[PDB]
Design a binder for this molecule. Structure first.
Ligand SMILES: COc1cccc(-c2cc(Nc3cc(O)cc(O)c3C(=O)N3Cc4ccccc4C3)n(C)n2)c1
Ligand SMILES: [Cl-]
Length: 209
């Protein structure tokens, strides 16, 4: 069995209980994006053609107040279906074990990505996440995540093409729409992501009124 319903319920409950500073979700997403960007930058050293699917390496944040969503897209190396399968099965089970053993030992759990389950820190602010990903060696896939969900990985033949990389669309919880506001987003990136050595872009939209 996969146990994704059980694992996502547990992590949703544990993460929201013990991390009262919800804004670190954006630190974990940018840090995962940065890691994936390092991977394609390195692969392109020996094979320049790896960048033919997308020449620019960046992270872009796209709020949408009408949809209630925050989207973080990068042009990193992306994930094959094998990669996403490995994350949903092997990594989720093992990292959950390490995460809550560190919880239970009173260890310092502030850097949650350390345990490989940094993805689920999205649950601090989001009630569901849609993962789109494209790796040079596979097709574009989409997978939906929610606390208790058992959605299947599906070939994305309807969404916009990524070229290469990963796009995380977070459906923001009702009482937390503050994380869709420009000034709040910019504050959070400045505070938690000074170390990042790729461009971080934010899409702002003119208001009417
Ligand atoms: C552990 O349970 C789960 C359950 C479901 C998904 C994941 C999961 C999915 C990723 N992946 C990415 C997340 C992002 O927010 C942004 C990204 O760009 C990626 C990505 O595509 N990466 C490829 C790659 C290659 C080398 C090193 C790092 C990375 C990250 N993570 C880091 N966790 C984990
Ligand atoms: Cl908007």
């Amino acid at each position: 069995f996969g146990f994704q319903a059980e694992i996502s319920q547990l992590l949703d409950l544990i993460i929201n209980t013990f991390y009262s500073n919800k804004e670190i979700f954006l630190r974990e997403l940018i840090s995962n994006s940065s890691d994936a960007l390092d991977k394609i930058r390195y692969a392109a050293l020996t094979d320049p053609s790896q960048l033919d699917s997308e020449k620019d390496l960046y992270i872009r944040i796209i709020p949408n107040k009408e949809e209630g969503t925050l989207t973080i897209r990068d042009t990193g190396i992306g994930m094959t279906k094998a990669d996403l399968v490995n994350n949903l099965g092997t990594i989720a089970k093992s990292g959950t074990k390490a995460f809550m053993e560190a919880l239970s030992s009173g260890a310092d759990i502030s850097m949650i990505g350390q345990f490989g389950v940094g993805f689920y820190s999205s649950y601090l602010v989001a009630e569901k996440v849609q993962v789109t990903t494209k790796h040079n060696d596979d097709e574009q896939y989409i997978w939906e995540s929610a606390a208790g969900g058992t959605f299947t990985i599906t070939e994305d033949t309807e969404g916009p093409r990524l070229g290469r990389g990963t796009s995380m669309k977070l459906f923001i919880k009702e009482d937390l729409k503050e994380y869709l506001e420009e000034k709040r987003i910019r504050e959070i990136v400045k505070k938690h992501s000074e170390f990042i050595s790729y461009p971080i872009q934010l899409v702002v939209t003119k208001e009417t009124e």
